[PDB]
Design a protein around this ligand. Sequence first.
Ligand SMILES: *[C@@H]1O[C@H](CO)[C@@H](O[C@@H]2O[C@H](CO)[C@@H](O)[C@H](O)[C@H]2NC(C)=O)[C@H](O)[C@H]1NC(C)=O
Ligand SMILES: *[C@@H]1O[C@H](CO)[C@@H](O[C@@H]2O[C@H](CO)[C@@H](O)[C@H](O)[C@H]2NC(C)=O)[C@H](O)[C@H]1NC(C)=O
Ligand SMILES: *[C@@H]1O[C@H](CO)[C@@H](O[C@@H]2O[C@H](CO)[C@@H](O)[C@H](O)[C@H]2NC(C)=O)[C@H](O)[C@H]1NC(C)=O
Ligand SMILES: *[C@@H]1O[C@H](CO)[C@@H](O[C@@H]2O[C@H](CO)[C@@H](O)[C@H](O)[C@H]2NC(C)=O)[C@H](O)[C@H]1NC(C)=O
Ligand code: NAG
Ligand code: NAG
Ligand code: NAG
Ligand code: NAG
Ligand code: NAG
Ligand code: NAG
Lengths: 49, 164, 197, 443
Amino acid sequence: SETKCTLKSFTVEKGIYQTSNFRVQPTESIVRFPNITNLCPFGEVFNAT
Amino acid sequence: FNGLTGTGVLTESNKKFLPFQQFGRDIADTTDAVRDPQTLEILDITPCSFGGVSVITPGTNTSNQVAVLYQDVNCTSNVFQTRAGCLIGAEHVNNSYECDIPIGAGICASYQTSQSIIAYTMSLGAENSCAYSNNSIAIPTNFTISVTTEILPVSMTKTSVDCT
Amino acid sequence: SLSSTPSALGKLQDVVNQNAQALNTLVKQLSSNFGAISSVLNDILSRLDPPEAEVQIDRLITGRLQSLQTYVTQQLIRAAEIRASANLAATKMSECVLGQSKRVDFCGKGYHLMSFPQSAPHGVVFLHVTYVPAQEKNFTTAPAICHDGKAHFPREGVFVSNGTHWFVTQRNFYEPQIITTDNTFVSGNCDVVIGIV
Amino acid sequence: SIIAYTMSLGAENSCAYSNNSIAIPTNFTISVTTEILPVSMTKTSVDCTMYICGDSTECSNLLLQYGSFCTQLNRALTGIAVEQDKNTQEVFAQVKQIYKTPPIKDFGGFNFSQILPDPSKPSKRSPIEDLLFNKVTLADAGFIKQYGDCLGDIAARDLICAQKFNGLTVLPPLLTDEMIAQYTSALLAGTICSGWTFGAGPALQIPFPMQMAYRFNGIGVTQNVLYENQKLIANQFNSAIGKIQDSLSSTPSALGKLQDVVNQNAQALNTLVKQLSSNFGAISSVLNDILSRLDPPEAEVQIDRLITGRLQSLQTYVTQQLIRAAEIRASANLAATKMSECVLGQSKRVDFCGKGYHLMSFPQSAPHGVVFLHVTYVPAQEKNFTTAPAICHDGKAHFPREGVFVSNGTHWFVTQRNFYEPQIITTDNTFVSGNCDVVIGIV
Ligand SMILES: *[C@@H]1O[C@H](CO)[C@@H](O[C@@H]2O[C@H](CO)[C@@H](O)[C@H](O)[C@H]2NC(C)=O)[C@H](O)[C@H]1NC(C)=O
Ligand SMILES: *[C@@H]1O[C@H](CO)[C@@H](O[C@@H]2O[C@H](CO)[C@@H](O)[C@H](O)[C@H]2NC(C)=O)[C@H](O)[C@H]1NC(C)=O
Ligand SMILES: *[C@@H]1O[C@H](CO)[C@@H](O[C@@H]2O[C@H](CO)[C@@H](O)[C@H](O)[C@H]2NC(C)=O)[C@H](O)[C@H]1NC(C)=O
Ligand SMILES: *[C@@H]1O[C@H](CO)[C@@H](O[C@@H]2O[C@H](CO)[C@@H](O)[C@H](O)[C@H]2NC(C)=O)[C@H](O)[C@H]1NC(C)=O
Ligand SMILES: *[C@@H]1O[C@H](CO)[C@@H](O)[C@H](O)[C@H]1NC(C)=O
Ligand SMILES: *[C@@H]1O[C@H](CO)[C@@H](O)[C@H](O)[C@H]1NC(C)=O
Ligand SMILES: *[C@@H]1O[C@H](CO)[C@@H](O)[C@H](O)[C@H]1NC(C)=O
Ligand SMILES: *[C@@H]1O[C@H](CO)[C@@H](O)[C@H](O)[C@H]1NC(C)=O
Ligand SMILES: *[C@@H]1O[C@H](CO)[C@@H](O)[C@H](O)[C@H]1NC(C)=O
Ligand SMILES: *[C@@H]1O[C@H](CO)[C@@H](O)[C@H](O)[C@H]1NC(C)=O
């Protein structure tokens, strides 16, 4: 059916035709950053002694 | 990865980067290799398969069975791996035949009888042999006359366009 | 053959089909918006104030003009191919029809005798008449014949033999002649020629 | 130091125009030269949406505003790829009868071992073909990709996986290298056993030295010359072939034509990808940056700008490929003609099948092309002789039947035009017409 639509015909002649492209899809979203461990004691300004 | 985005398959790389280099480059500067942000190692980023798909048709007035070729695809029914892509729906045989519908890399397809689409190595011509000898000659004793036809285009349709 | 196999004339049909497609493509492309609100020029003018209508039109002009330039470039390339074909066809008529060509597999397959042109839509069809060898036989041969110590070579042909006798024949047809002094020339002795009989 | 000088146009040389004086060759050599022609381009194709949009949805929706543009680009590239296989087929598949290469037999001293396929190799190439093959360098490292090198080496400037990334591909040839080698082998087997007769129709067996005798008569050298000088001729032939393989090895520029086709096509694709990264006046070449920083209509403006940029680059690319394709077709057509006229026959066209008088030729394959070995006859040592247009005898004028009248002072002899071999002038060597008064300079 793809070949028929591609060629604008209800009849397809013998031969090889490119009709579509194949594309592999991703399965998940992965984001990476370092451990950082570079935080300031912001909350100790609030929770001051 | 940090500020690097895109889509691809992530595998281990066999390359190493200097400690301050975070990303690497291909021939036209695509960002590809990256150091993993938490455990610096070189990660390999390679694109996913994206080739074209072609349909092999034996002819509508013969059969509605078709075979399908995937151009850059690894096959990993009637699945056969060709050097021109993964072929689905065709029976590979060990007999050579002249080409009908070509696939590529020496492989052609045709429709044959209990009919199916088959795949084969192309035949390059009839096997023959010239019996070379240093003291023997072949000489024609009769002849035939052949008439053949050669066709050449001479002209193209003449056209004109009113631009405005 | 021409009646039976419709693909024979595909070359001429292809030239025609390609030009038709190019023209149809040009017209169909005309209807696209190219990012415009509408491809109908009159719609753009009717529903827009001058400032924006002018912007929308510049977009449509760019689109239509690119289509025309693309069209023409392709026609020029196709024109180069048709010229090349025509130049060859002219050559073939001069060498195949107005004379006898010896160019191998240039003018028909086999040895050329004569040709006859026929007309066709947008082109020329040539009928080439060629000579082709058929039945052939296995014969013994030799470079020369040793007569009285002198070496005799075929004047025009090959010294060829059956189980008991040597004859001289023309190269393209087995018509044995008696080897006589008029069918051969003499040069050198019998010792210099390898395989003299 | 660098100097500037006037070009010399050629060696100064001379001969004397002179009446009643001729030169006639007394010796000759067999020379073999090499001619190289391109046959094909790498077959390629492009996914217009991957190149332009990179699967961006917003881009695709705007790409659809330029309806037939992808169709035209795709068809043009497809048409080129189709022609590349047709060009290959026309140049090599001239004979559909495959004559197997014979064992080496008695060819009268003629040694074809550097021409014919080497049975010991994994690739059935002649020593010369293997050399041609090894010397040309290709960037097109496969069609169906192996992942050993693609995944092993990253950020190492590679190409074919980069092309994959951008939706660009390389298609395999239909006819493979071994298959081409087989066609070449069949032609060589045919030529060596049957001369040109297999081209015209059936392959007739002809002793190799007789094929040569006919080729010499074709030039204008009476065949008795071959049978008497057979050893010299075979030795010069064998020597020349060895020299060619050495010349090809030592002169890297010899294959510059084939390397050039490859290099230019590789550059066209590398350029296309580099153009992809350009902004074309946009805020970014990356559609994702355009989208993340902008609301819908502003992104549409920037996206449309990039579509124009990428589309214009694709139109440029395709146009150049079509132009190059026209030229490769012309080269292939010439190569096909040369094979029929130089290999399957003995063309008399001047400077068409090598320099000198064409005697025979042998094809060899090469990556994306064909190499021909053209064997020609060239006159060598020569001598100065006295001549006359006719001999006056009893008042009748005698002209050479086939040749030139020549003398050494004291005596007149008749020879063939291209090789001194004096004969006594006899009535069997003359044409008689007219009297001695009408011919100017009669002796
Ligand atoms: C080779 O050809 C010759 C010539 O035709 C054959 O010899 C003749 O044979 C007929 C009988 O068929 C005799 O009447 C003639 O007198 C023979 N001619 C001569 C010159 O002897 C000969 O037989 C053929 N040889 C073979 C082995 O076929
Ligand atoms: C034509 O030139 C060739 C050389 O190309 C001559 O052949 C050489 O003759 C010398 C002396 O006898 C030998 O040492 C060489 O080995 C020969 N070379 C080859 C390739 O065989 C030949 O004699 C000359 N012929 C004429 C008529 O002058
Ligand atoms: C045909 O010529 C080849 C040279 O091209 C001869 O083969 C060489 O033989 C030597 C040993 O004597 C080897 O070291 C070379 O490597 C061989 N070269 C090649 C290309 O194979 C061969 O013997 C000659 N054959 C005939 C019948 O003359
Ligand atoms: C130049 O021409 C003369 C004249 O024909 C040749 O002389 C012959 O020489 C041989 C050998 O001595 C004699 O047997 C002949 O009788 C001489 N001929 C005549 C007519 O007297 C001479 O050999 C020729 N020289 C060359 C180099 O060709
Ligand atoms: C992150 O934690 C892991 C596990 O403890 C450790 O191996 C790694 O070195 C840490 N990271 C960084 C970015 O230095
Ligand atoms: C498919 O992947 C396997 C590894 O699982 C590999 O050995 C094979 O060569 C690959 N074939 C193709 C055509 O990519
Ligand atoms: C001659 O005989 C051989 C077999 O020995 C055969 O292959 C060849 O075709 C024959 N040639 C002719 C002209 O009959
Ligand atoms: C042909 O080859 C054979 C060996 O197979 C040899 O005996 C014969 O003398 C050779 N004939 C000629 C004319 O060289
Ligand atoms: C023939 O004569 C010319 C002068 O007319 C001279 O230059 C040439 O070297 C001579 N050639 C031979 C073979 O003697
Ligand atoms: C050859 O040329 C010379 C010099 O011009 C002249 O004297 C002589 O008569 C000419 N001979 C012939 C046959 O033309």
